[PDB]
Every structure is written in structure tokens, then in C-alpha cells.
Amino acid sequence: QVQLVESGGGVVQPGRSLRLSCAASGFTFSIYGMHWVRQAPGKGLEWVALIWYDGTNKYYTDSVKGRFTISRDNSKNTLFLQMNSVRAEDTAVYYCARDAHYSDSSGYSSWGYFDYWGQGSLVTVSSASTKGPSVFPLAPSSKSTSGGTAALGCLVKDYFPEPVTVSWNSGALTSGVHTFPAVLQSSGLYSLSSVVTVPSSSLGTQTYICNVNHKPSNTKVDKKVEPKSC
Amino acid sequence: EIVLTQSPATLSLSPGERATLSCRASQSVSSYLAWYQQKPGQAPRLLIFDASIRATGIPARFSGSGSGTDFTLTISSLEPEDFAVYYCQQRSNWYTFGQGTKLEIKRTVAAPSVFIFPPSDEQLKSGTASVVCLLNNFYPREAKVQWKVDNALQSGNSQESVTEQDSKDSTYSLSSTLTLSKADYEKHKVYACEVTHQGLSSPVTKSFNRGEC
């Protein structure tokens, strides 16, 4: 019944502070050491900090020492990570994880592994300000036709923060759709494309519209994607 | 620090097959080694600890072995829920992880279909030009995209993004976006994306002439 439910993540400007919470249920929180481990987008896992069951000892990885503080409130079954003076490189999904305390038949103990994990809390450290995407057609033509199939799409450019969602024809068109993972541009804004393949014979008679939603900025854009003659 | 090096980077296998994953430590970690499974958008899951002990609720097809500096995770018969990224972890000296092995679904070769898109007039009026090249529904993952502008090879001004393996057909798709200022874009005529992939006997180029679209 072990549950670790995190909260407190979001977008923070560099140098500011943010506090993550990890609420535990379904086990005796106060007898377990607890860890934070983070995963930057598209990267591996990095251990961040550990706190003993009783809050006495605390340990940190060097890149956060002096900036992050780990703490716990056993009466509230909650683990905390206070993140101060945040940097862009602190951008990551932050997991809380229970120290895996195991005892064998002859009483020998094991520890130092992560046997249960929170769902993750994304912390995005950026000086970028909330911005809706500009939506541009990726127009179909002979240069986007392979065989009897044409590709078209929408470029969803220069937004912050994640995420955006893209639908096609108000959701009526789902087959053949590929919405790519966003890339963080050098500007600090994200960009992605959403594409779909369709029969090339339908380019003259069928209208194609991408519906873009960026909730952080309340952006909603319906963009007609009309054919070209490349 | 203790550095954990995993190999191979990607293992391409089919259900039922035996999977063998390796983890090498820069110095001895004795048996203080664990293996994790992680799927996109999810937290990691402990599979094996103390090098060979299976965690509760982990299927018996998972087994770990090794000691000192060389460790192996074996899946005796891969099953569909096993396609994921696998990490090793040590707790002998602080806490470090390997860089991961991706266990992906093998399928037959599919060469990418290649599509190029010009920048829209609307974007150009705003001062920028994005040119998009799409490589659709291909397998295996390895591909090379080369941009040429007026027949000159581009470098440093494109970004790629790749989907996960499609749930139905197990292929990948990839976008390459070439970004120029409007002023630079307006200096050139021919915009070309050249694609190579092991399923293609010759590179596939798609190109357009600025102002013909």
C-alpha cells in the first residue's frame, strides 16, 4: 500500500526558492530513511539527498550542497526538499524515494536502494516568461508526398513552459498523427511540430486544421493547413 | 566517485527472447548493486538489489548476477511489459547510477518516408524561417539528416526530435528543423534535406525552391 505523493513543483526563476513535498501513506514513514533523486529531461538518474528516519543525519550531492535542504515532518508523514538559489541545471523531475530496508532469514540487513518512489515533480528553472506558441502551417506539396501519401502539419514554436497539446480537425483526425517531443531552443523557449499523413487525393477536397492548446498562457489556436505547390 | 557503465546502449529484442544487460563499475562495489526498470513518464522500479536478490513483486524471469566490478541483469524470457530503460545503481560509495540500457521492440526494417516543409509566409513576415524535414515511420532508429542550402552543407543550425516507438507498428518518426533568420533565408533558393538510413539503398533528398511554393 506504499504511496509517495509529491507536490510543489512548477516553474521557478533562477535564484528563487521552491519547496517540494512528498506525502507518504501505506507504510510506517517514521522508520525509513528517505531520499531525493532527480532526472533532468532526457537524462539519467542523479541522487540528490538523504535523510535518516529520525531526521538526525542528512547528506547531499555536492552540486546542491549549501543550496538545498532536506527535512521531514514525521507527524505529517511528509518529506521536504527546500530548493534555494535554483539554477537552470536544477531543471529535472524530482522523485522522493524510500530507502529499501531489507532483512534476510539470518537477520542480516540491507539498505541503500530505492524500493518505492514518488510519481515525480517537475521543477523547471528558467528566466523565460510565460508565452503561448506561434502556430504555423507545415503545408503539403509534391515535396511532402511519398507514393500516394502526403504529409502536412503544424509548427508550434516559441512557447513556455511545457506543455502544449495538438489535435487535428477538432479530434476527428487521429490516424497517422505524430506530435514530436518539444525541444528547448537556445532562446529558452520550446518548439515542436505535429504532423499527420493523409491520402494525397484528399488535399483538394479535405480541410485540415490543427488545434493547439497551451494552458499556461491560455493560448488556443485553430490553424488551417492549406496545400502549396513546391 | 564510482562510475557505472552500462552496455549495450540499446538492446533490440522480441518477446520470449533472453535479454542480457551488463553494468561495469569503475571500482569494486562488492555486491552493493541494484537494477531498476523505468518506462517513459514513470518513476523507476526496483528489480534486483544486493546484486542478485529479487525485490518483492518482481517476476522470476528477472535475475541479477555478479560481484566486484562486473554485473549482469538477465531476463530469461522477455515479455511486452519489459520494454523499458534499465539502470544499475551502487551504494558502496555514495549513490551513483549507470546511464541506462534501452530495451526496445525489434521489428522489420522500414525505410523512412521523407517530407520537407517550407517556412510559412506568416512566419517569414515575423522575421524567422523554420524549414522542417520529416522522416516518417522508420526502423531501426539510426538515421542521418543533412541539410543543404544552395547545395552547401549546413551545420549547427538544426535541431532534431524523435518520437517513441509507435504503440501499433513499433516505428520511429523524426523531425529536423533548420532555423534561419528571414534575411538569411531570403538569400538562398534551394533548401534540401538529405536522409540516409540502413533501409535506403541511396540517400533520399527532398528539396524545394524558395518562392516556388
Binding site: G33, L50, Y53, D54, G112 | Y95
Partner: peptide, 11 residues
């Protein structure tokens, strides 16, 4: 000052 000592109750 060892971060790998057992951090749980009943070590």
C-alpha cells in the same frame, strides 16, 4: 561523516 551507513530504524 559516511552517507552509506544504514539510515533506517533498527539497523
Amino acid at each position: 561523516a559516511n552517507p552509506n551507513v544504514d539510515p533506517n530504524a533498527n539497523p
